[PDB]
Write a protein that binds this ligand. Structure first.
Ligand code: WTA
Ligand code: WTA
Ligand code: WTA
Lengths: 514, 515, 514
């Protein structure tokens, strides 16, 4: 029940050679440099190689779990939108940043880095004309359209802290998150289209804003064009506001520990992520866990309202300068072959889905996946919950045709990027196992009965992290006490994931879950 | 009718050697490095040599005409007030930044770089106390007084976007521009003195502010000292506010593409927006090369600071170069039609930059006012604003330069930022009424309006277009980017539309027919 | 009556070697480099060696007395809180930043650099949540508790100009200072404890704020825990607000000439100090005048509401990365041996007091100091007024046991740091004499009758400074005309101290005073 890296992950058949490989020893050799007291040099070199800095940093890391003063590269200044848009636009403006798969397949198209950069700059200029300053919160209530990315980056361009809310959340949840983030600006659509169904996003927005006094400006994207109520003064059309603005906006120089965004967990708790550490973590996980290469076309099927959508739809892939996919539909619309039709049409090199979608597709039958070419795929990703051996085997056999590496990535919103996953070109996978910790992750197992670390293999308990990592959450927005109580107080000296986990005789990690 | 550069432009008679010369081939050699796909090295070298940067840039240029996302040196940070005041103050504080020629000739005096920097810092501190932030618009309604420059630079010191309004504008024009820029602070004077005449500037300001709700603070310069109405709380005297402030203010670190200023074109007036680094570089380079400016030179542009000529070649260009500039408060015919030449003789001006209207008026005023003046310190005579007739050109050459000064016919607009087509004085043989050759970074062409295609070769006529962006090009129209694109970019896709008909003769010289 | 540097200041008996010594010639050699037209190299080297800069400076100095446009290192950017907390926290987090001697001796404890940094960052986050921006004034009405050092530095961390008011000032003085600085945020305690006595700081604050319209937020430190009135909305508890905030805050990159703080002289006149020049001056005076070394324990017993508390309790010692003492009590509480009990308990290496406290202790009798060890002491400092020969001799004989160098430091709030003092390891002292000018100080004596500088030795007149020094006051807050009239108009070309002074035949300076 062991699956070595496939030939597509061995650099054969014209496929790119893996970044780390070919076996477990190479992963160990590289991972030893990323943890421990001598790991500062590796992290400094990676931060300078991966991200573009306006000012260089001096200190690599500081702080800890006990007080929630975690710092990474504090003296450096950078911009997330510069690292995700501007440098790649300068290198190659015509390269596709986003493959936008609309709800209707005929409406899908490619958005270049130039178009995405121009839209981001227009939205950033609109936000600046609204009075949005560095450190201000901007709520984003958007469906899975490509402009959402622009919206995100727009905030990241001006130093605003964006707070994304799942589209289709009720008026109460949206109101709670908007009130907690204390935003004065909300970005939303008139309506959303998903699975051939209409989401009345603007009606929900009006119902929620009836109880959100601090919101003064609403920017409304005309996604569908159907009639929606628009309050005079408060509501403005995205296209009309952006037509008045120039297609370029200067980047605000952010400290490394400036909060990049707030993401509310589904009182809602707002996990806060800073700029440089989170960006470095997601870029490195995208490059290594999925073996991304410059010409790759990443296809993550999550939602931008989720942490997976934050990391491996927007920030991670665009920081790497590769093509990412924004999928506006459901896996069974119009037909349960939608994922595979999309992969064949766009020649996706990686696929990142959730076990729930895989299970639904498996329940939908084999005729929808059996006759598809695929074969541009190299890495198949799973995230969100433990994947059963049957679902794992269906994913391997039909979506990858036994020629793609299957990565079971375990992480949370508070970890920022992937924590435990197999390296596709090095690690032999076990079905339903998140195998080994990522770079900078020193995870162990504590016995909850005694609170002591269970050394060795073939043990079971609660999963903890020994040391902070660059992409860890820094606080809970205006609720640092809750942050410390949830993640740092249960086991002092360790970060508490809250997931029961086991390590088998081979050292492989098995996440039991919450 | 060809005029080679005179001996004063040949480095002889103790005059400085020209930066570019002595003939057309040298101009071509330097210009070829400033255009095309291999010109990034030249522009990066010039940007690093001419301007002082707080942070270095990585990219030289990006963007284009189609969407209006033009970028020059985007990653670099700098300050216009630092590059126009502080570095020259550090090098030589006692050097004259401004020769202020007052309306009354006995009231004229030299303002040093130290005094100008201190005044700029006091006004910047006042504006900061008013709550003005980086990116905020500040309206300026000032006559041709030297403190106006300070006011300009004051905004540029704190990241404020200044919006200059010509002091001759009525209450309605001032109100329209002030409302469009959405400023909360207006810098103005009690009264102006031009041609012995009084401009009731504060009265017009009150009439306009009756319909300008967003303006909360008015800073009033006591220019004449006559009684004017002063609203309690809203209006404060410039001297009283500046006395409470320190004489130094820190320079705010500004991105290259941060908007330096808004200038409204004379239905709704269009606010042409200029960024900082590209515009500063363009104006400094045009000032150094088109007028052959040298460190000890005394530049005399007699335009108004309410127009782009005053923005570029009274304030930003000459002060970025660290030379003496002139602020002329009077008219060409006050007190007598010899005022220009009396000024040039008294201050030993090395360059003159006027408009064909003033030269035509002086020519109609008779030769008795110019024939008996020395004027030998002059080396370059500049004309800007409209095509200059051969008779006016010859009167300018023979009477003002005494046939010993180069005549530059500089063609450009507010949207170009700096001079686009002009003769290089030490290299180009001029033809009267001709803006001869494009400046560095300008790749101009003639397009047939009926067909829309570029008319290659010589002896062609059509509309003037620019193939590629240049550092000092306007970035947008304030809150009206659609108007910017429609006016300058959609008429001929892939090109920048000047709106001016132009012809190129057999020698390659450009002739601007005009709008 | 001449006193050569003692063996404790000669590098003997295991004591650190003095930075400058052993005689007057060495002081002259080092001081000649710090004044004159060729002193820019020395000051540039010292600025780059002493302070951590975000951006390097190009110009060393500019401006002058006549217009009050003094500039030092204008193009450089830095942060005072970074230089006082972050770099030392990065080098050694567990080192004691503050020895907090509480009013009750049993309540005293050591605050480490990590704890001080975390408290400063929490307060900075609270202030940022109050809307405090760079350049905004924040009033501080705090007793001699260690958190005051945090509050100060919190402002310095975010570019806020802190304005400290002596605790125990009446409601009218507090109101005048708060109204003049135009602050919108006030930091104070519920009550203060000094000399076993209670100071109703919150009651005075309420009485003052009844006439301070611009104040919108009050942060109240629960120093004693006794019941005080708290206005709903306006007043919030320090601990409650700080518990919601993360323990790290990014440092605002500040221009060198950005105003660090406003200190009102006891209409109140707010002396304004910029960041880089003041920080450099205080750090250099602390290092050289007191011969501070990395492991030293500086004990300045002034008040943080005074300029001495600004320079040699908070900024100077913490910039040097050494331990500083925050003394909450009086010299005679609970007994007149409190100073010497504290010195013996914490092994203070330097003591910096005022002549009034020394005279009070001398009046209290010799039985309180005669039996104390006091061996760790090396330097004894006096500041505030001319110290009588009898008081000087008592200080030398009983507090130092004729084994400590006695430095008489003359300076004002407008000089920022010490102007005239003996270098302890080099200068032979005379009782009641501030001997020689400090680095960058070129003082002279002007005859007030004629206004001309009196050349040579054995002259008397008014003390003037020929050239600006880095730590000189830049202005009086919104009263620059008063600043010029007080300090620069009486003798054009010079800085007027306002103190009559004499120089004897040996070149020693004798300050007559106001
Ligand atoms: C990235 C989503 O972050 P969140 O939406 O905050 O959910 C985080 C929570 O999902 C669960 N989980 C995620 N990935 C896996 C996995 N590979 N195997 C098992 N369980 C998993 C786990 O319980 C975790 O703590
Ligand atoms: C600098 C003033 O800028 P503006 O006030 O925006 O006027 C810009 C408009 O003036 C005209 N013009 C300016 N210089 C010349 C010239 N040398 N020869 C011919 N015509 C000229 C032209 O029509 C242009 O388009
Ligand atoms: C640091 C206190 O600054 P301030 O509270 O502003 O008082 C400043 C004023 O105290 C006096 N003074 C301070 N130190 C001494 C000293 N060593 N010898 C004599 N007189 C001194 C002097 O009159 C000065 O001008």
């Amino acid at each position: 029940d062991l699956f070595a890296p496939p030939p597509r992950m061995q650099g054969k058949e014209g496929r790119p050679k893996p970044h780390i490989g070919p076996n477990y020893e190479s992963y160990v050799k590289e991972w030893a440099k990323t943890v421990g007291p001598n790991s500062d040099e590796w992290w400094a070199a990676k931060a300078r190689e991966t991200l573009d800095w306006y000012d260089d940093f001096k200190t690599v890391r500081a702080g800890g779990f006990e007080h929630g003063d975690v710092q990474w590269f504090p003296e450096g200044t950078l911009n997330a939108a510069y690292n995700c848009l501007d440098r790649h636009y300068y290198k190659n403006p015509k390269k596709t940043a986003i493959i936008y798969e609309a709800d209707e397949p005929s409406e899908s198209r490619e958005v270049s880095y130039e178009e995405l950069m121009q839209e981001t700059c227009r939205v950033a200029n609109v936000l600046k004309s609204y009075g949005v300053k560095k450190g201000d919160a901007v709520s984003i209530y958007l469906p899975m359209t490509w402009q959402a990315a622009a919206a995100f980056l727009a905030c990241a361009r001006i130093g605003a802290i964006h707070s994304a809310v799942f589209a289709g959340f009720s008026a109460e949840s949206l109101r709670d998150r908007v009130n907690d983030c204390e935003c004065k600006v909300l970005i939303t659509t008139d309506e959303g289209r998903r699975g051939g169904k209409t989401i009345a996003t603007k009606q929900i927005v009006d119902a929620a804003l009836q109880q959100c006094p601090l919101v003064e400006n609403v920017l409304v994207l005309r996604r569908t064009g159907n009639k929606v109520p628009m309050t005079e003064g408060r509501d403005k059309w995205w296209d009309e506001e952006c037509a008045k603005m120039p297609a370029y906006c200067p980047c605000e120089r952010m400290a490394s520990e400036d909060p990049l965004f707030i993401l509310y967990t589904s009182k809602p708790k707002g996990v806060v992520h800073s700029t440089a550490g989170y960006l470095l973590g997601t870029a490195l996980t995208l490059k290594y866990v999925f073996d991304a290469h410059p010409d790759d076309r990443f296809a993550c099927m999550a939602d931008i309202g989720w942490i997976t959508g934050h990391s491996y739809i927007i920030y991670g892939p665009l920081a790497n300068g590769i093509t990412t996919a924004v999928f506006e539909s459901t896996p069974v619309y119009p037909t349960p072959s939608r994922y595979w039709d999309f992969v064949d049409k766009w020649k996706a090199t990686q696929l990142y889905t959730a076990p729930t979608a895989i299970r639904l597709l498996r329940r939908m039958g084999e005729d929808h996946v059996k006759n598809h070419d695929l074969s541009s795929l190299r890495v198949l990703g799973s995230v969100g919950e433990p994947i059963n051996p049957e679902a794992w085997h269906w994913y391997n056999d039909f979506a990858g045709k036994n020629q793609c590496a299957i990565v079971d990535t375990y992480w949370m919103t508070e970890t920022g990027s992937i924590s435990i996953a197999p390296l596709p070109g090095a690690i032999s996978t076990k079905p339903g196992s998140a195998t080994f910790p990522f770079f900078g992750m020193d995870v162990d197992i504590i016995d909850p009965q005694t609170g002591q670390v269970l050394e060795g293999n073939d043990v079971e308990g609660v999963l903890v992290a020994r040391r902070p990592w660059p992409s860890i959450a820094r606080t809970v927005y205006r609720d640092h006490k809750r942050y410390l109580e949830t993640y740092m107080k249960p086991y002092p000296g360790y970060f508490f994931f809250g997931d029961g986990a086991a390590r088998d005789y081979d050292g492989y990690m098995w996440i039991k879950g919450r």
